[model samples]
Target chain A: SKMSDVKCTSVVLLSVLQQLRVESSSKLWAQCVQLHNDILLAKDTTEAFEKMVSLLSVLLSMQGAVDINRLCEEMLDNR
Target chain B: EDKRAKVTSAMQTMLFTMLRKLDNDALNNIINNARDGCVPLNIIPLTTAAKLMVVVPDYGTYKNTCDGNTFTYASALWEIQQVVDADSKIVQLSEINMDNSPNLAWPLIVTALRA
Candidate 1:
């Protein structure tokens, strides 16, 4: 499921990054970079995917405003 | 099967043409118009899937920056991923028969007939 995992993880990262840009805080930006690196250095697609989801959960719990649904809808609408 | 292949090829051609022209508004229009099932539910997912298939291979090489080329690349990846997930959900919810399962036994059947 590497392909599927990669796709899902990429999608999640994309949503989070969109919100991260809007938030525009250096701290969140730094965390995003770490998330990017973690994904890149992952031993496998599964690991990369898990890392992204974990980061997403952390961002959500921190009350970060990453709305995957709304962001995704906007993307589709504006595309 | 031949019909499906031809249709798929034609669809790809149309999508590629629109993508190249940066006519994403037209693409969005297609989605909106198709909301009542005018077009296949799989179109958005297929387009996004194609985009992801091309982009993901270079994910590691993209620079981690908030501006410049990296930003553009990241934005494209992010957008495509969103479309894939969102449209996939739409496709799944609909009762459309999007199944295009391949005939796995075709080669075996041919071999058996020849033997």
Candidate 2:
């Protein structure tokens, strides 16, 4: 039955529990070197979640461009 | 009057920052090579648009920052009639308020009158 197959998939996911490396430790970020690796290697979660996180990271880099002393950039966090 | 001085000083630092964003040592070289005249500092309102001039190492006017597509510095617009104008003096922008103050944007217009 479909329920049994779902249970089998869950078991497989559980089997790989001990192997997870989320964040890179290097001070400087380099573009991914191994192109041939499975896309799934980078996606520990659903593709949607992975893409969302990546987008957020790109936006985060813009934070430095923010004028910290400007009234606009300072408005939210100051008080 | 004192506020004008404060703003002037801050604006100069902001101008300096624009050159800093380019190739390494580009900023230092610009200061070292700054002539008393020629591309002397000038100011204009953003709304009072002017051709955007370009500069490069040993090369000036990277490309014509001209035509209607180009405009003047936004800060000059925001503080219209308040600014002292471009080609005022090097003393105008020498004091920079680092670590505080969002300076007037740097790519200020010189003049499009020659156009």
Candidate 3:
């Protein structure tokens, strides 16, 4: 069950990393790549799982901010 | 016509690349734990993962049908249309374009539709 959890979390995290790589700057993208490898090589699955969840939340929030900014730009342009 | 074909080919390649990243076991876990066949926006958003779960089983079938001979947007759209029409969740989610944001998983559905 622990292994399954780890696998699931890794899959989800890697997918998120893939998405982020599409738009992330080179500097940030390198960080994401590092985080990705860290997740893979992590021996403490429990801690890694928690960290992955926290990282996902942070990344999603960052993406959300960008989305909001874009919406504002589009709305202002329409005005 | 030539451009459309080229775009269709490129889209299929991209879709395959993205789809391949989804591990089958993890994907199954996500689908199985889904509430009422609706996966949350934790990994993939807007119920796209749920919709993907539905199509993933028949991915080969759909891919074959859509890729018959040469990849064409018409075939791909026609295939995706059937699934969208049958699933109310997908239809509803499809309506929310999210300002066409590139970050959201919603575009995967749109890309699949337009592929």
Candidate 4:
């Protein structure tokens, strides 16, 4: 049971980090939205989880602030 | 050198992908407004731990998609705080890597808008 339910719960945090950092597609964007929503909506959700979504949205929107060029490069190396 | 190059490629895609999704002119207006003090960008320094600062937009709910917490943001800050305590080297290397690559200074600013 632990292994079965683990995938969804695991990597949610770090994945959100990298997900926001990368140059995302529409799917990735939508996927992350769903992921965060599920996280917040889940019975197991925490006050802390709600806070992270707020932080992620802010990071995703600031195209002007970051060097978008550099952000993409980091993703490429990661891939 | 390789790291800097990678940062560059990553940023380019991030910018271009955004252009396809939103009007540059309209978006710029919002940013200009924020810059002009219409809204404040909160600059939070990571403090003695790393050579990075996080800037954030003080707007939107926890899931407005953009310009706010989106849930992930607030959650991450707390998570990061915990991890920074848990893995001192991670924060320490963040400083080292930032120092190794000055360009990191810029993205980190946009990383949170001014955390």
Candidate 1 lDDT tens digits, B1-115: 7886455444433333332243233333332322222222111111232322111111122222112211222113222122122222311112211242121111110000000
Docking class of 3: incorrect
Measured with C-alpha atoms, the lDDT of residue B103 in candidate 3 is 29
Off-target runs (Cα >4 Å) in candidate 4 are A1-57, A60-65, A68-79, B1-4, B22-115
Ten contiguous residues minimizing lDDT sum, candidate 2 chain B: B74-83
What does candidate 1's lDDT look like per residue over A1-79, in tens digits? 4544454444444444443452466765666666656766777755564444434333333323333334445446766
Candidate 1 wrongly placed segments (more than 4 Å): A1-8, A11-16, A19-23, A62-79, B1-115
lDDT of 4 by residue, A1-79 (tens): 2222222332343343454454355654555555555544455434223333333334434544444335445556679
Pull out the clashing pairs in model 3: none
Local accuracy of candidate 2 as per-residue lDDT tens digits, B20-107: 3322232232233232111322211122333322111110221221223231221111211111223442212222223221342333
| Per-residue accuracy of model 3 over B18-72 as CA lDDT, tens digit each | 3234433433333232212222232222222122122222232234333422222
The Cα error of candidate 1 at residue B30, in Å, is: 32
- Against the reference, the lDDT scores of all candidates come to 0.34, 0.26, 0.37, 0.35
The superposed Cα distance between candidate 2 and the true structure at residue A73, in angstroms, equals: 27
For candidate 3 chain A, which ten residues in a row score worst on lDDT?
A63-72
Error (Å) of candidate 3 at residue B61 is 47
Each candidate's fnat: 0.00, 0.00, 0.00, 0.06
Say which candidate scores most in DockQ. Answer: 4
Backbone clash pairs for candidate 2 read B41-B87, B42-B86, B42-B87, B43-B86, B52-B65
Docking class of predicted structure 4:
incorrect
- Number of the top-ranking candidate, with lDDT as the measure: 3
With candidate 1 superimposed using the best TM-score fit, by how many Å does residue B108's alpha carbon deviate from the native? 60
